[PDB]
Amino acid sequence: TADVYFKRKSDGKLVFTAEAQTASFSQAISEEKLRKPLYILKSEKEINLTVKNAFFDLEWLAMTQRYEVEYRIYIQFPNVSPSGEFEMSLENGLAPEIKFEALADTDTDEMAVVIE
Amino acid sequence: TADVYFKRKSDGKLVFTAEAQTASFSQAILRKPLYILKSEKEINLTVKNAFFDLEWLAMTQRYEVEYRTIYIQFPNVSPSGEFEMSLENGLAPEIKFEALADTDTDEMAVVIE
Amino acid sequence: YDYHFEVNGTVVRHKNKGFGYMERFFELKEERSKLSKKQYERFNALFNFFEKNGVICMAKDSIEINSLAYHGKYDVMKKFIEEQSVSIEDDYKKAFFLACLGRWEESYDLYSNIILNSIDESNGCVYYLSQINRYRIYQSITQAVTQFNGLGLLTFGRHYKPFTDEFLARIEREMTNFNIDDLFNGMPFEFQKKYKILEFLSDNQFLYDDTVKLFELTNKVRSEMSEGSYSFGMSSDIVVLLRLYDNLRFLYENCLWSVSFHEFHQYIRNSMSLLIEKAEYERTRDIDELGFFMEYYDFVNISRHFKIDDIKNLERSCSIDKIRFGEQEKIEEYLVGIAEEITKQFSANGMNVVFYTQFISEAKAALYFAKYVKLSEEGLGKIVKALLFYFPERDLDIGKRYVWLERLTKCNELPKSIISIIDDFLVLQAEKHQNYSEVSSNGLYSRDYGALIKHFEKNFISKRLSEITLCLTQDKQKQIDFLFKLLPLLSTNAKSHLLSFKSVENINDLMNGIRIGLIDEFTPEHEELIIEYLETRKVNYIGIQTFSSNDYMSTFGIWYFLEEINNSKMEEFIGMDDQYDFFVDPENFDYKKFIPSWLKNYNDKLLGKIAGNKHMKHHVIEVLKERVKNSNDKRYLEILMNYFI
Amino acid sequence: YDYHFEVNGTVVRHKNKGFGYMERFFELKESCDERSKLSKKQYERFNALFNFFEKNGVICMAKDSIEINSLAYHGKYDVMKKFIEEQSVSIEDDYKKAFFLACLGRWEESYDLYSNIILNSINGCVYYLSQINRYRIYQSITQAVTQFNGLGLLTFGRHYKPFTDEFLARIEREMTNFNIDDLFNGMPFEFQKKYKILEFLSDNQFLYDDTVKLFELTNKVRSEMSEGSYSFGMSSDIVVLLRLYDNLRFLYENCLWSVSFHEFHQYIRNSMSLLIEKAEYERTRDIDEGFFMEYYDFVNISRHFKIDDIKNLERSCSIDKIRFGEQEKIEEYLVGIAEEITKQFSANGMNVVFYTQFISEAKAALYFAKYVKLSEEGLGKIVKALLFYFPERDLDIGKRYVWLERLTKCNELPKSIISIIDDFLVLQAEKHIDQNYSEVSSNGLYSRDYGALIKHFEKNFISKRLSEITLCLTQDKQKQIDFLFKLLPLLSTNAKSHLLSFKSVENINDLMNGIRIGLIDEFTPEHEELIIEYLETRKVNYIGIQTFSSNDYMSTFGIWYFLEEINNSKMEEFIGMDDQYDFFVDPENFDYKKFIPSWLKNYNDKLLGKIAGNKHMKHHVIEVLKERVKNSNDKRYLEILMNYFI
């Protein structure tokens, strides 16, 4: 029952807050054939995260009319892309669940930082 | 999609006939001397659309199975009597039976081609 | 729909637009003195109702089922039925108990009389629930009558007719054209306004919502397991458990007969076995860079709502012995109660058929699941005595009953009292042997009981069997060759007396002698007997084929492979069946006929000898690799890792 | 309930106590000598009865392929628009047109058309279905409005408001007090009597019965799979498929909008992915003493499967060994999806309401296209749609590369597709002039991966435009410089030298990029100095909390040391900073209790072989692999175990 804080990457503004529900890090090796030389240690690290009850900041909502995630140990995803996949249900819809995937800039080459 | 005939062991009367629906043959392995190849084999068969013969019914008011497709013969089939009631009324009766093996014969099922 | 109540016990404002009464109510529960006296009393009642039903607090910030039917207190229920019911409320659970002990005619009459007496009902809830339960009892009676006229003839042999034709005709007349779906609509509108939560009980398929929610939760849990994700809040598994317990408690505490139907049984079986599978996955879950234990209630649910085949599937999928079993004293008491009931009913004139059909499926499951629970010597002895002597043989044959007994012995070693009980069982079986045959669906006859006795004692000599053998005469061959399979249990004098009439005439006698240890090396006579049997088998083999499950030929091939047979005449029979050429001439077997399932029958010695051949090891290694990569048996992988056969 | 009709199409006498009318009807149908003795009016009615029974199914009595015809199911988004344009002859033509309007977003127009159809419906079943569909359209409109208000700002970055506030207020006023459950009861008695089969559509949860039946069949199928039993008659898998097709054809053919909701998507995803699991288990059947995907299966998987669902299905069962029939139709469907995406995003944005509904299916179809063989023209169209016009928010650089490389599997990269990759890289380089701009991928794959794919499939490809840009490159634009650095193999020799003029190995990331492209083949003393200096910096920064990131550089250095690529013995000073570095540097004293089995996944043939042949750390890894293979069903740990026996 830990909380995820969404921040706008540029500034300290809070995009929204939610509770971390499911976090999947299915980071393994990719195809071998398609990619004597010095080892590079290729990888296909992926980090998905889901938040159960996310309420968007009122000031951010008013202003709206790159993102960072802080999962509280403390984990931080400097860059996260929220996947906006909307599906409707016959049962009138009420839990707004937000799914986002961690991204990795080429220069930094790091996706998530977990620190005590 | 073959047919199954359930017959009385002694008299040979056909208790009923139905349509074979499922068959599970799962034989697997505390239990220096000569190897005896001890095994614990089980054969279960679930039957569909079983209607009891009028003659045997009126008489009733050991068994054999003959499942003919290529040609299968199960001697000493014990009919399991698990009865459950659905709150939804009922739809055909499903019969399940387990192949039995006599100590002397040691044979549970026979395959005829 | 103003609020949303969740299984955890927290309310969330979902549709309430006006003032939030629950938001203020929870804080008001957490300065209450300013409320009126009547208002204070009503709040006390509301707090008791909410805390008893599990609605604790708001969103921002185990189970105990009290019922004699759930716990199988089949004698306390009888005592309660015997007592004069003071009130209609006490006569509702009394009719439920009457139904729970068979007695469906009495239960139907009692429900009808409750409906008759419920005219002056203050609320009419008892009348509605009695209508539901009477419809359910009529359904059960109809299905039981149909089974008795059908399967009830093959099973039990005879015709039972538990319900008189007059009663059946009367109930059919009363229940004619009774649409249960309309029952809630055909009620006083005050009842419909107040008791809207009971509407779902009316429809003939009222578990569809629960089944659909469990399907969604199962899909979510399986997706989590496949992806390997980690759930943080209340996992879908915990939600499944909470809803399962809520449904069980609501249906049992309110004395609703729909708790005994196949729909609810399957719902509970799927709600469980999804908690168990998820727990097993959690146990065998690899760590990355960045528990569940079964209580008494879980044991009761698995025993009641699981068929033996369902428990077998659960065992196959996940290892249940690695799941720690709690409340083992209560589990042992439950098992002892089941055994006591079975022994009491079948030891004294038998058990009424209507109750037997309901109770045997749960007794078998309880004694099957008793493998993982540790039982005391007294309780274990009671369970064993009930299982062997008094458990009906139409359900547990000799082979399957031995499997039950050995599973019980797994966790708790066989004590002296249990060995005495097994000795009594074997003596009774011997005295049964008349033109009587011991047919077993499992292939594990009474000799396996003696084998278990010897394995757990290695010096046990049964007095009564020895005395019987001393009294054996050549005339009764059935008892002679029954005790021949029990030779290790007999005394030395009994052994000598029995061996007088015991001759190795056919290959079956040789097999029994090898099993009992009388034969340790093949004499030329045994070799000649085996070769002559092979002669006859080949002669009769030579335009339709016949495949049998005797497996004698496989045993001969194994004997040749292990060198226990050193006569080079068996090669003349090569080609009659497979698994014999595999051991006779492994190089020339043409393994395209090889069956991977064979390797499971072999033991450590045979499989090690097969692996060390080095002239047939590579084909079998390929077969094992294919099976391990394709199937999820995990026994093929165990074989491969143990010796890379 | 007088009779029992099941999926295969054979009637069964269930509760008929009087004369058997259905048996006699089938007898008269099969033997048509009698059909003349019938009264002429009765024979004319029997003709229509036979037509209706044969169109739906009901082929004969119990004792004795699916084709769904609808522009909505086939995704004929261009035929549907033309059909909407044409003037409607009849009321049913308006009802189908309103369903099509709802399909192509345009929920305002669909709601208005449904209201008009309700007004003008004075059979009586068209009014019922229009009421249901208008309720569904209102539900979808409300949910989409809520999503755009809350989620839309985050996902798209800008508030959209597809529906005017006046329209939303009007629909809220209209649809209030409209209880869906009572929609059928408040019907003419004749309609209720005749159309009892439509009753299930009235309730707000009409898939509960179908979902429960699918759950029961799934449990049965799983029981057979675990036990290994053999089913002889109509297997539960066939029943599940038949009921899935019945529901799909009934909802789509009758133009019911409930076919677009999450409940039906999940029902279809569970109905499928259970046929697929059972089919995959069928190939692994244990011999003791097939199922293939057609066009309809491909369309169902594309529509009702999320990308994560397809990934899970791939994980559980090897879905590349399943025969994919009707590949011409599948390729036509994929080309239609690609053309629709190109038409949308090539000119003037897109329809946001239609976008939210169609992008999931587009992504699923292009992900699932890995298993189909696509012609060069169709493959080129699909690639161009995926790379140039597919929305950036949906498919990032790494995910888009994964999609393209998956497409490359069945169909090897031709020169036509290589040209599309080349101009995609040229466009990306053009985007690399703003210093703030930087391509970020959730997967961890970038444009260098596209260049590597191009080189792998040609090995002599030279990109004229990227070489031109490199020749134009100057020290001022550093971002273009280091973008072209990772693409050096694509650059020409003159371009190579011109870029290398300003290219220097300043940091460890620069050295790693140089190794990846191929500029570095053996560590010079300067590279070793840089690596050791970075290790000093990391250790100094280490020296009361500990933070572990996902850079993975330390693991790379450890692997280099283990493989003898780096031959300077100063790395042992840093041992203990992070694992997978001690494992390769000093395996003997690693205390493998901290070993992570997942590490073995990242290694390749060379590294895995070296690890296995170490023989001073092979036993611990073999134990880790054995428990991983026993406990888990991954099937990749087993492959590692048996390919090298590590």
Numbering used by the authors:
A (entry chain E): 8 to 42, 48 to 77, 170 to 176, 191 to 211, 214 to 236
B (entry chain G): 8 to 36, 41 to 42, 48 to 77, 170 to 177, 191 to 211, 214 to 236
C (entry chain A): 336 to 365, 369 to 399, 406 to 634, 644 to 786, 789 to 897, 903 to 1005
D (entry chain B): 336 to 399, 406 to 463, 467 to 633, 644 to 897, 903 to 1005
From the study:
The recently identified bacterial Sir2 domain-containing protein, defense-associated sirtuin 2 (DSR2), recognizes the phage tail tube and depletes NAD+ to abort phage propagation, which is counteracted by the phage-encoded DSR anti-defense 1 (DSAD1), but their molecular mechanisms remain unclear. DSR2 contains an N-terminal Sir2 domain that serves as an NADase effector responsible for NAD+ hydrolysis, a C-terminal domain (CTD) that functions as a sensor for detecting invading phages (as discussed later), and a middle domain (MID) that connects the Sir2 effector and the CTD sensor.
To elucidate the structural basis for the NAD+ hydrolysis by the tube-activated DSR2, we incubated the substrate (1 mM NAD+) with DSR2H171A–tube complex, which was obtained by co-expression the catalytically inactive DSR2H171A mutant and tail tube proteins together in the same bacterial cells. We then determined the cryo-EM structure of the DSR2H171A–tube–NAD+ complex at 3.0-Å resolution, in which approximately 60% density was observed, facilitating the accurate tracing of the NAD+ substrates. However, we did not observe a clear density located in sites B and C; by contrast, bound NAD+ within the Sir2 domain of DSR2 adopts an orientation with a ~ 90° rotation compared to that seen with a nonhydrolyzable NAD+ analogue, carba-NAD+, which sits in a position ready for catalysis in yHst2 in yeast (Saccharomyces cerevisiae). Instead of being inserted into sites B and C, the nicotinamide-ribose and nicotinamide groups interacted with the small helical domain, with the nicotinamide moiety stacking with residue W60. In site A, we observed the stabilization of the adenine group through stacking interactions with residues Y282 and T52, while residue T248 forms a hydrogen-bonding interaction with the 2’-OH group of the adenine-ribose (left inset).
